[PDB]
Design a protein around this ligand. Sequence first.
Ligand code: NAD
Ligand code: NAD
Ligand code: NAD
Ligand code: UDX
Ligand code: UDX
Ligand code: UDX
Lengths: 164, 457, 457
Amino acid sequence: FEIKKICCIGAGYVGGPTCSVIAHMCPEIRVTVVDVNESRINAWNSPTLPIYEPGLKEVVESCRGKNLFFSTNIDDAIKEADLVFISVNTPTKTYGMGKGRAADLKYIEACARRIVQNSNGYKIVTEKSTVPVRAAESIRRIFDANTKPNLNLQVLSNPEFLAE
Amino acid sequence: FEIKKICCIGAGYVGGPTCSVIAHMCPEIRVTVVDVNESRINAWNSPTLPIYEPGLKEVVESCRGKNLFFSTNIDDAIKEADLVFISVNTPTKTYGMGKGRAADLKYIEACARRIVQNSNGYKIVTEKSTVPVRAAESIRRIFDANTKPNLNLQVLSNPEFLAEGTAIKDLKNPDRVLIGGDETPEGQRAVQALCAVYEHWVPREKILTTNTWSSELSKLAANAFLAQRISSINSISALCEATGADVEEVATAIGMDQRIGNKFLKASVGFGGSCFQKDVLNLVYLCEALNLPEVARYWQQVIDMNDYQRRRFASRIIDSLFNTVTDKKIAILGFAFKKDTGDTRESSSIYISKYLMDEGAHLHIYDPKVPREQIVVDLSDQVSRLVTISKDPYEACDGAHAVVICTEWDMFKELDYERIHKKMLKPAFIFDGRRVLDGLHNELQTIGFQIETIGKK
Amino acid sequence: FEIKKICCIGAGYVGGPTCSVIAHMCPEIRVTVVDVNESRINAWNSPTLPIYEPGLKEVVESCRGKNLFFSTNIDDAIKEADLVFISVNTPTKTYGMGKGRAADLKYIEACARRIVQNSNGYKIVTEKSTVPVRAAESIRRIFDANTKPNLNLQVLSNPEFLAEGTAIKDLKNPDRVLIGGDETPEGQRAVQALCAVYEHWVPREKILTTNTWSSELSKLAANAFLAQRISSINSISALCEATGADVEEVATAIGMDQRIGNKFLKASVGFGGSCFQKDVLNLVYLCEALNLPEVARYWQQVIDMNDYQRRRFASRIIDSLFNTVTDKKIAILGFAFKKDTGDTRESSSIYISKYLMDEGAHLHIYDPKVPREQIVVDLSDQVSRLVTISKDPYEACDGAHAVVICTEWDMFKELDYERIHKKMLKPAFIFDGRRVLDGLHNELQTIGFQIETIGKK
Ligand SMILES: NC(=O)c1ccc[n+]([C@@H]2O[C@H](COP(=O)([O-])OP(=O)(O)OC[C@H]3O[C@@H](n4cnc5c(N)ncnc54)[C@H](O)[C@@H]3O)[C@@H](O)[C@H]2O)c1
Ligand SMILES: NC(=O)c1ccc[n+]([C@@H]2O[C@H](COP(=O)([O-])OP(=O)(O)OC[C@H]3O[C@@H](n4cnc5c(N)ncnc54)[C@H](O)[C@@H]3O)[C@@H](O)[C@H]2O)c1
Ligand SMILES: NC(=O)c1ccc[n+]([C@@H]2O[C@H](COP(=O)([O-])OP(=O)(O)OC[C@H]3O[C@@H](n4cnc5c(N)ncnc54)[C@H](O)[C@@H]3O)[C@@H](O)[C@H]2O)c1
Ligand SMILES: O=c1ccn([C@@H]2O[C@H](COP(=O)(O)OP(=O)(O)O[C@H]3OC[C@@H](O)[C@H](O)[C@H]3O)[C@@H](O)[C@H]2O)c(=O)[nH]1
Ligand SMILES: O=c1ccn([C@@H]2O[C@H](COP(=O)(O)OP(=O)(O)O[C@H]3OC[C@@H](O)[C@H](O)[C@H]3O)[C@@H](O)[C@H]2O)c(=O)[nH]1
Ligand SMILES: O=c1ccn([C@@H]2O[C@H](COP(=O)(O)OP(=O)(O)O[C@H]3OC[C@@H](O)[C@H](O)[C@H]3O)[C@@H](O)[C@H]2O)c(=O)[nH]1
């Protein structure tokens, strides 16, 4: 089994530069970075990127629209994907248990739900962040409980080590 | 010698049904029940009663108008009466010495004064409540200090043992009737006159008679004993959870020992009701005051356990929703402190709702008897942002992640769980706070629920 | 599968009685009771049994040498047996972790090792104790590690509910029999084999079956519920003394609530016995180990109350004797932890004797069933100077400043107190730490006794 289409939900400091580089290094792979933040997506597609990162602009411009894409169309990106990265943010809870301290997993949970909804057959789903807090476990729970016939979702952890 | 007219001040859970039952068993007696709350009196006379209580409608209609009355005319009823019951609330003090712990006698005290401003000659005056704290003494202190010639008022203590949802049954065959009065020739004649009333439907073997203080301690103590058992079994429910046992099984084996008995061993999200918590608080308070901190310390645990049982239950719900419940829709089935009443005082359902609201949950509450505008009042922006009162249970479980059963309403046992499931977000949790879905366990798993329940795994 | 031979390791207060009743109710089955302690075994084989227990002499003397045997030959009894009871003692650790709290399992362990050494083929091994504290698991650990081909040892749990003093009547008519075994085909077959022993005299609906853990938890919990009831009522006895009430009247009142039951509500100087303190102490210790500190501190109150109640009573004694006993002759009536047994383990009498001895009293101790050598061991040079063991009670109160009734022996109610009052120093005090002298109160005041009693000022 070979990955030929990659989707990444989350075009942040992690999702963006990680996907850009996978694209640079693997020309036969299609890499699609998605995000709900329309503004951040257009900026990725503009001559001014939404984050500053030395040497990033060269990488993006060497494969954007070639094997690297940025888009607000999350649904179709997941649908055609072999691997789905989850590369979203887990803000600190502002009330209740673990307030000021624990991570809020709500955006990971929303990615898992959306993935199940837009998925059939076999896909690999990889949580990729700098602080993974029970992320893979939580993805698995959603997937286990939202079975479809011939949907086979594989859950992996692939933590990101880069420093901004 | 002999009681023919009864007044009852307070038309609440205690005054209302108990006088209703006296009427029914004692046709020769004219019973009048009075309250400042016109709105409550009106309902007592309407075809819809202000409280829900099985058999209560039929008992009231059986003799309202004939020998049973409700009116806002306090003065006239006091005036014509041989016996005046006080059955009023005593809210917890909001300020002063023992703010937030001791009962406030400010309504019981107002009652006694109003009695003297409307009484001449002989009257028997009886304190009657679920939790009596120095109630007889503070009626007496007021009678002693408002002395009119020819006025002879005798003070009796007559604790009410009934449990809401089972009031009529309890009233009609009680395990015992406790009446305390001064051990003077005069107190004895008033005690005996009170006996003679109950003697209409209760065997004399079961009528116990003491002095007034020993009467109140007896009820303080007994209520606490009942609460201790539930806290005790709830402590075991945490142990069972942490080790693979099942508290229902542990309780069967405990209860079959006749020296312990098998009642009051149903583990739960925690006791509520207007009786237990305040009864322990008061007993604690009393012991601190009397220089008995070992005893205070002893009974305080009954409350700490209950608080912790509530908290542990909440925190399991939140855990399962992987510590985030912002905008997640959760159903709350059951708001009363217990089945077969509309009463929410100190209900565990409130407390769960509060811990789930702090997590930002969208709560959808259904209860078949609690008035919608009472749920709203109990949970008080935050309420208007997070709370919906559901009309039926199915719209409460529509779009929901979790179903939380907080009251043991028998109806919950036979909801359409298949239908509820189809429409829940997955994974779909039922948290049975009452062990009410037991044995139904296999069917629910099969359907596709994750069933968490107290004292199992 | 058919049990023909039973061996029981531990010929104590549990094993001797229990095995005798099985022998008596199962005449087809050979019943062998073994022990390392030879004077114990010798006594069981003698006209004078080593423990006192109503009805026991009759039952033994009816089976001994027929199907009931007491031997020191542990190896051969294990070797031939189909079922092997383990019924040995578990003393409190005297050092290391859990010092003074956790039970020491060194004897359970040596039994299981001995059983593997002496066994071949199929045996059922059953742990029977009043307080089982990870017993079954411990046995299993050893059996699992020491295998032999065709050796098949199956472990069950069978907690004993008998109370000393009524052992025979409890074993012949238990409220229930509790038996745990693995949720395995082999476990289930061993469980049946034991039910069938019990089914010779216990009806099937009174026998409960479960896993080993649940069974041990149920026992730990029930024992605890029982001691709570006593601490609970004892706490109300203090409160009664502070406010001028009678705990016997309050207890009567509480007790008639059929949800509380009327049993185990006799206030006392304190519960004793091998069971209760050690049960709660182990329940607490375990809760802490499972990270349940709220459950831990809940149960701890049961013990703390009982320590207070003992103390209150000791110092209440010293206050009535003008704040000093530092040379006075005091009578101790009752050394055993409860009536109708010569057992003294954890007895409240040991604690009152001792406190009074720190304080300079000369004690004269009478019990009708406790050997005098046992009283000397329980108190620990001081014994030399202060303690005297009396032969009858009237010898004990000759010269005395006060009588202190520690144990509810029925003979104490029927003493001629006028004779006693005569030879007692004056004014003559009786401290009734058991309420055995209720109703006789005035009569004794008439004689001029000044009488102090628990739960009554
Ligand atoms: N972004 C934050 O504000 C934040 C705060 C605390 C912790 N974290 C955690 O620390 C590391 C930061 O990651 P990042 O710096 O690249 O964060 P980032 O916030 O810069 O990128 C996260 C992107 O995911 C997008 N996103 C979130 N939920 C989505 C959804 N459901 N569908 C589509 N897009 C969605 C967000 O719009 C955001 O653009 C993360 O790896 C995570 O472990 C992030
Ligand atoms: N008041 C509280 O908040 C509260 C909370 C817990 C327990 N309790 C205890 O419960 C028992 C009584 O129970 P209940 O359920 O029937 O109370 P309730 O609140 O249901 O009924 C009390 C009735 O007394 C009426 N009332 C009060 N003072 C009055 C006065 N001076 N004159 C005329 N009417 C007056 C009120 O309007 C009300 O209808 C007592 O033991 C009480 O102390 C009270
Ligand atoms: N020892 C204690 O202080 C104690 C206290 C509370 C509870 N318990 C538990 O509750 C029950 C109380 O038992 P009991 O009152 O009959 O105690 P017991 O002291 O009266 O009898 C125990 C018998 O076991 C014998 N024994 C011990 N180890 C042995 C061995 N290795 N081989 C052969 N015989 C051995 C002892 O000699 C003694 O005769 C027990 O089943 C025990 O597990 C023990
Ligand atoms: O010697 C130092 C090094 C770093 N820092 C500070 O420590 C903070 C973190 O700096 P980093 O170099 O680690 O940059 P990052 O925080 O972007 O990366 C860090 O978090 C994400 C992980 O995936 C990276 O492996 C980790 O280095 C910065 O504020 C930096 O100024 C110091 O004050 N002193
Ligand atoms: O086994 C049990 C028993 C009771 N409970 C809870 O304990 C609380 C009290 O329930 P009760 O049945 O005792 O009802 P009440 O509070 O109406 O009556 C209580 O106070 C009034 C007294 O006069 C009654 O004798 C006493 O029972 C409820 O929250 C109930 O659900 C349990 O959780 N488990
Ligand atoms: O109401 C009571 C009851 C009991 N007690 C005291 O509590 C202590 C225990 O007495 P028990 O009647 O329970 O006798 P035991 O200790 O022999 O039995 C206890 O432990 C072993 C278990 O099998 C029994 O079921 C349990 O009762 C004694 O000190 C007794 O005098 C009270 O002080 N008041």
